């Protein structure tokens, strides 16, 4: 139980280190923001 608890606590700690050192990790959500922003700016530029 001590070993399993320490491995769990360490593996949760590595998530913050991974996200803090991997800008591309959120790429699924940042691409959903970027696609909707690219679609709106394409629609606005078509007024010109």
């Amino acid at each position: 139980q001590k070993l399993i608890a320490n491995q769990f606590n360490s593996a949760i700690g590595k998530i913050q280190d991974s996200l803090s050192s991997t800008p591309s990790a959120l790429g699924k959500l940042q691409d959903v923001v970027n696609q909707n922003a690219q679609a709106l700016n394409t629609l606005v530029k078509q007024l010109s």
Binding site: N41, V44, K45, L47, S48
Partner: protein, 48 residues
């Protein structure tokens, strides 16, 4: 000229409608208008 109120403006034949306000935009001495992504006017230099 009237500010912070919605007005049916016309500067040098540039007809539109909007709330005119003073601005912090440093138009360089040769610049007469400023524009948005849509190719619509977004600021102007008052000709009077």
């Amino acid at each position: 000229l009237v500010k912070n109120k919605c007005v049916n403006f016309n500067f040098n034949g540039l007809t539109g409608t909007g709330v005119l306000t003073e601005s912090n935009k440093k138009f360089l001495p040769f610049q007469q208008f400023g524009r948005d992504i849509a190719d619509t006017t977004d600021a102007v230099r008052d000709p009077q």
